[PDB]
Amino acid sequence: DWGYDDKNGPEQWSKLYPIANGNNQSPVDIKTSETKHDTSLKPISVSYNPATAKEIINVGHSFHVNFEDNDNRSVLKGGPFSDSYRLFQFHFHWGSTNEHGSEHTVDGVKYSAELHVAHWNSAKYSSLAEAASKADGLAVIGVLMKVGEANPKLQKVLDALQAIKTKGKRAPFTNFDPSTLLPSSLDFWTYPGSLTHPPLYESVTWIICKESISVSSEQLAQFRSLLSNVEGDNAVPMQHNNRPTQPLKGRTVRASF
Template sequence: MTTVHPVWKGPASVPGGTRQSPINIRWRDSVYDPQLKPLGVFYKAEACLYVWNTGYLFQVEFDDSTEGSGEPERGSGPLAPERDSQMGDDGAYSMGRPPAEQHKGQHLDPHDCCIGPPLMVITLFQSLMWGISGGPLENHYRLKQFHFHWGAVNEWGSEHTVDDHVYPAELHLVHWNAVKYQNYTDAVTGADGLAVVGVFLKLGARHKELQELVAVLPDIKHKDARAALGPFQPSCLLPACRDYWTYPGSLTTPPLSESVTWIIHKKPIEVAQDQLAAFRSLLFSVPGEEEKAMVNNYRPLQPLMNRKVRSSFQATHEGARL
C-alpha cells in the first residue's frame, strides 16, 4: 500500500501545521456535544455542471454563483421551489433524510435510525439558502464540488479512518463560507472558509443514484477529460442516518489549507464491486503517456495533536461494529 499517490506534486506536510487532515477518529475518545445542531442540507440538482478527471481524482463541479446556487439577490422576491426538491405538502423542507426517504405530509420521527440530533425542518425562506448550514457551522456554506478518494483494492482507500478501520473509498462534498467570503478562492485560505462533508463507502448493494455518475466515467478516463452531467442531486449520496463527527482540519490536497470544518458521517453508504472498479478504471495520465491507474489517491493520516473530535451522538458499543 502506498502512502502518497504516484503523481502527488504538493508538499507531504505543512511546516508548523497544527490541524492537518485526514485523521483516525477514535470512537470512544470523541466527545458528545449536545449543543451540536442537525446539519441542514439542501442542494439544487440543476446547479450540477460537469464531471472531470483532474489527474488526481474525478470531480463533479457545481455552479456556486448566487444565481446558480439559487440564492436570491438583495431586494429580490422569494424564489419558487424546484419540483424535485425535498419540500413537503406543508411548505417546509425536511433536511433529515435523503429525497428517496421523504414521506410528504407524514410525521417525521426524529429518532428514526439515528441516536443524535432530531431531523431538521426549515422554512421556505431558509430554503432559499441552497447548500449546508447548522450542524457545527455558524454560517451558510455553498457547494463547490464533490469528489472521491479510493484505493487499488477494497482493503484501503478512505482518507479518514475510524478506530483504525479503513473503508475502500470516501466521498468529500466541498463547501465554502458564503457569508464571510466573496468566492471559493478567498475562502480556501480564510478562517472558517471551508466545510467538507465526508461519507465513507463500503462494499455492498449497488447504489442506484451513484450509477448515474459511474455511467459517464468511461468518457473521462484520461486526465483533463470532462463530460456533461446533470441534473444530479448530491444529497442522494448521503446516508439515511445523519449522526456525525466534526473537527477542525485542513484540505487533504495542496495547498493543504487549515481552513476546513470537517463533518464526517458515522454511517457509510453501500456501493457495488463493479462501481468501485469503475473508479479504478480511470487514469492519472493523458492520452499518449504511459498509463497510470488512478488508485490510492488519498493522503496518509495526520496527527490529531491537541484537537478534539466532537460527535452529534453518544458513543455506544456500536463503535466496535463498523
C-alpha cells in the same frame, strides 16, 4: 509536481508544502472513546438544487463533479455552523484494493473509499478562492464507503466516467442532487482540519457521517480504471488517491450523537 506515487506522494508533500506537518491536518482516525458529545451541535441541513450541477472533469489524480456557485441555490446549514455554506463540488478518494481507500478511519478501521461534498462560506467571503485559506472558509461532508452491495445512487456518476477517461477531459454533468448520495442518518463527527491534498490549507470544518454508504467491488474498479495520462500516451490507471491519517495534535473530535 505532487501526486500519490512514491516519488511525489503524501510522504514527499512536506518539501514544497510544510503545512503538511501542521497542527490541523486531515484526515484523522476518529477514536470513539475520545470523542466529546456536544449538545450545542444542531442537525445537518442540506438543500441542493439539481440545476446547479455543471461539469465532470478528469484532473489526473482524481475526478471532480463541479457545481455552479454564483448564488445560494445549493447550501449546507446547521451542525457547528452559524453561516450558510455554498456547495461547489463533490469527489471521491479510493485505494488500490478494497482493504484501504478511505481517508478518515474510525477506531482504526479503513473503509474502501470516501465521498467528499465540499462547500465554501459565502456568508463571510466573496469567492471560493478567498474562502480557501481562511480557518472558517470551507465545510466538507465526508462519507465512508463500505464495500458491499452496489449503490444505485452512484450510477449516474459512474456512467459519466466513460466520457472523461484521460487527464483533462471534461463533460457536462447536469440535473443531479448530491444529497441523494448521503446516508439516511446524518449523525456526525466534527473537527477542525485541512484539505487532504496540496495545498493542504487548514481551512476545513469536517463533518464525518457516522453511517456508511455502500459501494460494490465492481463500482470501485470503475474508479480505478480512470486514466491519469493524457490521450495517446501509455495508459496509467488511477489506482489510489487517499492520504494517510495525520496526528490529532490535541484537537477534539465532537459527536452530534
